[PDB]
Symmetry: C6
Subunit: 167 residues, 6 copies
């Protein structure tokens, strides 16, 4: 793990970058208790300034309930982009889009983009720079010109260390 | 205790945050003599600038006299908020309120919040970011989305090391 | 390998300099898969500012297809100078030329050069400062007054360490 | 003594604070020779700029003669406050008072305060933040909400190390 | 050699100084191949800015031919001063003169001075601050109030390390 | 030799201070050859700025000859303040006086005071801050309130190392 941690320092230095996460809930212990704090910690470090142009993408696989998490995050303070335009289906162009920004006083439209994998039918216009996989084997968005980082963990507190959120 | 000192460097980096403390004095040695100088150092470090917007909350548990400590702190040079309009009852909305700040010259309305637990019945609109429990086991404000640091100590100088007030 | 990395710290500090690379792909593992990312990282570290005034040259010996790699680089978001005007032939004066630069907002006409070695017959008027040779023994552009660094590698990732792109080995 | 040195790192970081020293000279060797240099160094390091609002106080217990020390300090180039108006008696509000200051060009009214403990009867408006005691057992100004630092030394060269005036022992 | 490197840190700290070199090529291996690069790097380090007022002097003893070296250095990009007006013999006041400088945009008249010791007759107006001798025993410019640096080398890769050109 | 170097680190930091040197050359090896270079280095480090406003004094003890060294220093590019008006006897007020200084462009009237001990009959109005003694036991300018550093050396480079002019 300490071998992996410093490998990632170059990836996470850039201010403007496109990052995807794919996660599987079942094989992580105490997931529903720590996910919210995990996201709240990532955002403040990596998505709290003007130069941080693009928010990150979180994809959860399996049969899971997004509404509850979205409400809990709204109570915590954060706003999310899901991609729906009123119905039960997801739209790619609305999911991937640029937010409004105001330099002074600082205002932001949304800080993260959330979804499920099964619903996202298709691919983006611009391939991702970094694809992170946590306990998933392979995904359709793998390519030779894209950097794939793949891990296996037993608790979420382990990943924060890798990503430099704690000591 | 050494690793925990390094464990908390990230939490105390942010300037503006809502921090809560709970203390039980019966099981701490030499409390009455050292509490004032603990509070004074914490305030002079983490709540003595303009960007430091939310003052901290100190909750004491047990049967205890706040008035004497409040007078001692006034003599030392600090001003406190207690949430009391004449009467014994504690108005919650008047204890979770923002103070007046002036950049030049620097002046503040109050520097700390002080209360008793049993007197404070209810809850806040915004949940606390960090909840420190010193010598206490359970509380009503614990939740999944709040960070909780529970400790057990025999003296205050031990806590000074953890919170970076002192070199040793 | 570790001392080689530090032997080069002084060469690569300067902002403006003329750098040439020669490569043989027949004897490298996973070349087709790692090449684009090699180029992208090098460019991002040494070709993304106003002070950086000379883009680099990459020459590939053998029988190889440049067009596909060019399309892939375009998809990745980078532009290349090849030195051709319609036809098959290559022009030295149109491959060794200065690019347009706009300071605010930053724009650059092109970020790298490309070619095949056999097609490029001739030479430049100003001789290269640094001529990296990766797995090739001898060339026609070597001289007493040019700095020459020859290496032997088995996979591309080692050069990342040698040249400070990724610290971990 | 290496243990005590870094304990005082935070206390001496601030620019504006109120410090008090109590000393006993009967049990220190070669006192009259080095007292003046001690004061001069302390003053140069902690009392020589605009942001240093409060000058420090030196109290001596015993049967000492202050006139000679005052004359020697004037020859060395320093001005002191003693807290007297013609007479023998000592006044408190003159001794604990703020001085004139001019930022540009920098000038100060007085740089230190001196006295004998017995003549000074009473207390101040504001209790002191730091009370150093050197070879002295008990004082009336000791209080729970005041920081007290008690030491035992055979020479004055050691206290300079403790207080971070000179490099090493 | 690890001893000498840091000994010279103080001499090479100042920006404006008068530095002299004396060299013997007979007992150095692979000399003609590496001289030009040595001069190039020294110049790039110590004679590229407005504060570097006085360029340095290189003297060669023996039966060497200077014309070829001057041509190679011209091709490399450096203009040299040789102290001759007409061609037969040397003139000291032309050799030891001050150049033109423009602060913005930077242009300089010449970067280095070059000569043969047998041809140079006499002494300067101001004595040298630092005199370097490489495989030479005695010289007439040795005085008590002048710093001397006598060395022995079998290659020129060593002197670069001594002078902090490479590590 | 090493810790002694660190003892003097605090003394040499101040920009403006009055400094005196007393030297005996009979017992030093290779004095004439190295004195000038010692002086030149000391001046370049400690007496070549605007804020450096109190040039140092050197006093040489014995039957030495100043004129030659003074000429050597003029050749090397430095000016000195001897203190004579008529080349017979020294005057204190003329040897202990302030120099002219122009900030832009930088120019200085003189950079050092040079003298012999026997000729300087008297004392200054302001006592020296730092008195360095090299191979002399006792002096008439020693006092309780004046710092005295006394050494014994065999070559000048040792003192150079002590005073931080050369690494080693």
């Amino acid at each position: 793990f300490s071998s992996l941690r410093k490998s990632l320092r170059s990836c996470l230095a850039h201010n403007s970058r496109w990052r995807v996460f794919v996660i599987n809930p079942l094989t992580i212990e105490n997931f529903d208790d720590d996910i919210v704090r995990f996201i709240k910690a990532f955002v403040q470090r990596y998505s709290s300034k003007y130069l941080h142009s693009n928010p990150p993408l979180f994809m959860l696989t399996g049969d899971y309930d997004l509404s509850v998490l979205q409400k809990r995050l709204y109570d915590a303070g954060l706003r999310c982009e899901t991609g729906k335009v009123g119905g039960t289906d997801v739209i790619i162009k609305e999911l991937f889009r640029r937010p409004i920004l105001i330099r002074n006083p600082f205002r932001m439209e949304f800080s993260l983009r959330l979804a499920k994998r099964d619903e996202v039918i298709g691919g983006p216009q611009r391939r991702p720079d970094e694809l992170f996989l946590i306990n998933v084997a392979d995904d359709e968005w793998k390519h030779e010109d894209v950097n794939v980082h793949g891990f296996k963990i037993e608790r979420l507190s382990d990943l924060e260390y890798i990503l430099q959120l704690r000591s």
